[PDB]
Design a protein around this ligand. Sequence first.
Ligand SMILES: Cc1cc2nc3c(=O)[nH]c(=O)nc-3n(C[C@H](O)[C@H](O)[C@H](O)COP(=O)(O)OP(=O)(O)OC[C@H]3O[C@@H](n4cnc5c(N)ncnc54)[C@H](O)[C@@H]3O)c2cc1C
Ligand SMILES: Cc1cc2nc3c(=O)[nH]c(=O)nc-3n(C[C@H](O)[C@H](O)[C@H](O)COP(=O)(O)OP(=O)(O)OC[C@H]3O[C@@H](n4cnc5c(N)ncnc54)[C@H](O)[C@@H]3O)c2cc1C
Lengths: 370, 370
Amino acid sequence: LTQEQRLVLDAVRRVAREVLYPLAPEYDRKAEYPWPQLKALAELGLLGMTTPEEWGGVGLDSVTWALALEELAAADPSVAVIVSVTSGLPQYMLLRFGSEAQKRRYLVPLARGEWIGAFCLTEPQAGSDAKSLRAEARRVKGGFVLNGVKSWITSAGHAHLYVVMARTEKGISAFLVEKGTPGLSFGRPEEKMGLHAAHTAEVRLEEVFVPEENLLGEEGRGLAYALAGLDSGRVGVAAQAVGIARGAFEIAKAYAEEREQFGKKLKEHQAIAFKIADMHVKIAAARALVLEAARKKDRGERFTLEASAAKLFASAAAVEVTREAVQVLGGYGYHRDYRVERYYRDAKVTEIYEGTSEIQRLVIARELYR
Amino acid sequence: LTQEQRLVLDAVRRVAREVLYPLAPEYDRKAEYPWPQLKALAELGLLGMTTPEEWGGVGLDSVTWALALEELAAADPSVAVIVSVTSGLPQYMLLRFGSEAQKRRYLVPLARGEWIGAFCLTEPQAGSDAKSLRAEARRVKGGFVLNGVKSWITSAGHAHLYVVMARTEKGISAFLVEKGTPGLSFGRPEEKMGLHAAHTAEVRLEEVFVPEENLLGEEGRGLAYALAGLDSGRVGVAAQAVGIARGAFEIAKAYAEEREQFGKKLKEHQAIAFKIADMHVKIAAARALVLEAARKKDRGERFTLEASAAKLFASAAAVEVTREAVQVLGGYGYHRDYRVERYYRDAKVTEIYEGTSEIQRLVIARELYR
Ligand SMILES: Cc1cc2nc3c(=O)[nH]c(=O)nc-3n(C[C@H](O)[C@H](O)[C@H](O)COP(=O)(O)OP(=O)(O)OC[C@H]3O[C@@H](n4cnc5c(N)ncnc54)[C@H](O)[C@@H]3O)c2cc1C
Ligand SMILES: Cc1cc2nc3c(=O)[nH]c(=O)nc-3n(C[C@H](O)[C@H](O)[C@H](O)COP(=O)(O)OP(=O)(O)OC[C@H]3O[C@@H](n4cnc5c(N)ncnc54)[C@H](O)[C@@H]3O)c2cc1C
């Protein structure tokens, strides 16, 4: 890493350790939306890592961006997912497909972290098959009228701007809906296994009016925009999966060096030393795939294949590492006060969102036979 | 890859694809030593990739080196092993610890590929635990007299130069022994599961006299010299493991495209498509780990951890990849004519030589707590 890249990570590391880490436990057991953490990050411009400085962001390179997400996830996976989403598709789509006026009033406040954004694609009946969503959008003189139900929306009810994907006569399109808008509604946050602080709920739209200017890019070419940003999002989630593995790993490594049983520190029993070594290898391999993808992105080359590979491997690595991390601490690994149990719960979901492991495999195979 | 790197690799592909690949089958079947392939590689200076030009080598960087070994192993694992060994410790040790006369006399002929080299350390009772070797080296009149047996020696009886690790009153030392020296004999090549063309056999030293000039480095410092090239050797084996995996993967991927069963091409069956994707992911992860260690090596940094991690991972990926590669071709995967079976047999040994997987984990663990 260059001095510059390490300077950035020095800042990310500081906020992660000083703000995210100490607050993580309370926010997880209370399933409380992380406003203090986000604000702490916005002030550092970290909610705009994927956006150029001339749009309110800090425009980092993909490698530094990936390592930052890992650092944030290692401290609080919940805070990291929200970050990756608000500076994810919402800021990706506005930047590459939005108008100068849209970029001026929407991108800027997102990149600067004044607003939290959200992406709405998933529907109760359509998940992996986005290409078949049923949210409607009819042309009304003045704009459009949206009707539908979006599910599993990260930051729902908290985000100021929502990028809603709906269908029109011409096809699937992207819309920009602000909070407060008449008709827009939010269900109660879903109770889940992990990512407790990262609220996810339904975004309900009943006869919501959207101005002609709130339409994002070409009508009917929205799904294409979304998939365009998915490659990046996956590298981002892959990065997070590595962070989740690293966070649990560090606790296990330290523990095996302090804890003693049968007259030796745990690391002195081959079984345990081998678990610590396997964990490391999985993490190193996972990060290697993440950075390779990030570098390819920066070279302006197609990186769909490398993105799914990294997402797929890292999420599996995260689950596999955390399982052993808990194991190393014995009973204590099951205790909330030791954090590894929290990492174990969060790890599993990385195999589901941002494209399930099954879907990542379809994409990979498709790419291999292109 | 830079222009120069592509040129070297383009040259590696040609020889691997026009010489190694075509001959591999009959040499494996007949368990025949690969002289023609070795000669074709020597002419290209490929038997000295790891040595500077001032000493007869082509002084390639670790990345081009790693990628080249991968390429050679993909076409013929047996030839790749001999290459990595003849240009492995024998040349590593001479370069770094040899005297001007020794490098001029032995290193140059090895680097140019005029001679094949061999490293003798392993004994019937000492394998993973090198320190407990029994080879004896007594200080005689104006020289040394060696006695002992070395087993599992790659290129035994074909190599012209043998680096024998024996012990003297001061400790384990490195000795250069040329073929033809009285007292030095060889056993018949061991009957192994794979790497058929890569003959390995016993190296007997019965009252073998070695002149003072043929001692490498400081007496009793030999074991240190050896473990010094070990990090590089493991990177090389890791690269070969990747090659073995690539070889099998390519055949299976293609087959899944041509073969049909139940009305579709195999790739159209999800289970098969997913196997192909999974093979790709572990191969990519393996390669990434290998190149990460290669670069660190080139930066002159300690890469003992990265070396063991790469070798441990790639070796396992080769076994996992080949297992499924055989599975994709069904009954034909078990047939000699389809080559995958050969990659499956060769892959397993990569988890054993150059430090078993159990050993790699000790190193990784030791390194993580250093
Ligand atoms: C914590 C979390 C946060 C999320 N945040 C958002 C968000 O902010 N915005 C948003 O729009 N969505 C979000 N989602 C939803 C997520 O994108 C969807 O869950 C996912 O895209 C599809 O999963 P599903 O629930 O529809 O399951 P399904 O698509 O019904 O799949 C169920 C099972 O079938 C498998 N499967 C499906 N199709 C195939 C196939 N063709 N071949 C083989 N197997 C198949 C799936 O892999 C899975 O194992 C989030 C989800 C979670 C858990
Ligand atoms: C094809 C091939 C080529 C080879 N070429 C050479 C060569 O050119 N030169 C040379 O000197 N040698 C060579 N060898 C030998 C090889 O280096 C040794 O086999 C290896 O270093 C040690 O294995 P071993 O056979 O002595 O088994 P052992 O050392 O007896 O080990 C047996 C089992 O016990 C495990 N084990 C050992 N110690 C521990 C421990 N402390 N904790 C946990 N588990 C342990 C091992 O991992 C293995 O699972 C070659 C071997 C093969 C198969």
